[PDB]
Ligand binder design. Structure first.
Ligand SMILES: CCCCCCCCCCCCCCCC(=O)O
Length: 386
């Protein structure tokens, strides 16, 4: 596991000049320009940071084609051949448009997923590594924590890139297919019988792949929009405290307290209430106990006072705020009580939580012995027959 483990190449400038040289008069000059008009788009782009760098090339294609179609329209059985060509160009532009849309949406999703959530953890990681580099020119525990946190960020970053690439493949594939169909029908190539068969194929597919498409969509919303947890977070699902090992579109992989690896479908996880200790504020806890009904109220008062002193001597573990609650009188034999305390940590480090609680439980033991707090069973009257 990742967590829990024990020459032509640069001839474009020249090519562009050669293309310009192609005409100096007349009507076909725009058509000729199209052959190397990409250079013009590149220059326009130069003339025109995450989105900018990632999208400029998609924009260039879109506008490039737009111009080619516009000049084509204004340029002019060759009669039917040209109708065909015109529509082919239109289809190509539609394709580029959709391409641009697709790219944009994935860039938004991919970026906002992390940029608006853990920017600050990245900066903390950089800081500590700068410090380690400087130092090189409980210390060891600190050093290990710094490396483990960096690894966690690397894993989150890689899983996001992977998930986005998977989305990219699904969308690209459907986009390509629909563009083929669009081309065939707008150009007039497909005939009536072909339209009928394509129509049927789509309808049938709509049923077959219906649940699949819905499931993927819901999984995307769960993972990227709701985002109840990240990689490495300790989460609670139906009472199971589990560490998130990996996130994917269809599944989330978790490690149980005993490090069993669990594959948990997102289509199910989407309907559950999910806890997240990593994202929690300092967490609290409870120690329940019972005392005899005859315990003097003064000993109850001494118990409260002794507990307060303990907690105040250990402020690295406990917040000063606590409550002692008397809850119930059972028969006239038992008083049920509970101690409510506040930890100075959240429970991402579960073992540390238990160690601190364990000491508090032993302190309670000690206080009861010193104050002579006891619990007795009710007496039983016996009658003897011979
Ligand atoms: C149902 C159509 C495909 C869905 C999109 C591609 C896969 C999305 C990611 C899900 C996890 C599959 C890849 C990891 C498999 C493994 O554990 O080796």
């Amino acid at each position: 596991s990742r967590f829990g483990e024990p020459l032509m190449i640069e001839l474009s400038v020249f090519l562009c000049l050669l293309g310009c040289l192609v005409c100096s008069l007349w009507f076909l000059l725009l058509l000729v320009i199209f052959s190397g008009m990409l250079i013009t788009h590149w220059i326009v782009h130069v003339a025109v940071l995450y989105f900018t760098h990632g999208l400029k090339t998609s924009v260039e294609v879109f506008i490039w084609i737009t111009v080619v179609l516009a000049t084509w329209v204004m340029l002019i059985q060759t009669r039917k051949i040209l109708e065909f060509v015109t529509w082919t160009i239109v289809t190509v532009l539609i394709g580029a448009f959709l391409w641009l849309v697709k790219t944009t949406l994935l860039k938004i999703l991919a970026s906002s997923f992390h940029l608006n959530r853990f920017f600050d953890r990245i900066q903390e990681s950089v800081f500590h590594h700068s410090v380690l580099q400087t130092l090189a020119g409980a210390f060891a525990k600190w050093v290990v924590k710094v490396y483990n946190d960096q690894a966690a960020l690397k894993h989150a970053l890689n899983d996001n890139k992977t998930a986005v690439k998977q989305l990219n493949k699904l969308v690209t594939a459907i986009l390509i297919v629909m563009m083929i169909v669009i081309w065939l029908i707008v150009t007039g190539i497909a005939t009536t019988k072909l339209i009928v068969l394509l129509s049927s194929q789509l309808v049938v597919a709509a049923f077959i792949f219906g649940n699949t498409c819905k499931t993927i969509f819901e999984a995307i919303i769960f993972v990227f929009v709701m985002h109840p947890f990240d990689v490495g977070d300790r989460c609670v699902i139906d009472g199971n405290k589990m560490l998130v090992e990996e996130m994917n579109i269809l599944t989330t992989v978790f490690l149980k307290w005993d490090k069993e690896k669990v594959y948990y479908p997102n289509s199910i996880l989407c309907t559950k209430a999910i806890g997240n200790f990593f994202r929690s504020p300092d967490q609290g806890d409870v120690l329940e106990f019972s005392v005899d009904f005859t315990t003097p109220v003064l000993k109850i008062g001494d118990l409260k006072d002794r507990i307060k002193m303990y907690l105040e001597q250990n402020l690295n573990f406990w917040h000063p705020q606590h409550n002692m609650v008397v809850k119930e009188i059972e028969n006239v034999n038992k008083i049920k009580m509970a101690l409510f305390v506040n930890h100075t940590i959240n429970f991402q480090d579960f073992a540390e939580k238990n160690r601190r609680r364990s000491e508090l439980v032993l302190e309670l033991k000690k206080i009861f012995e010193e104050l002579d707090i006891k619990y007795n069973l009710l007496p039983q009257e016996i009658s003897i027959r011979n």
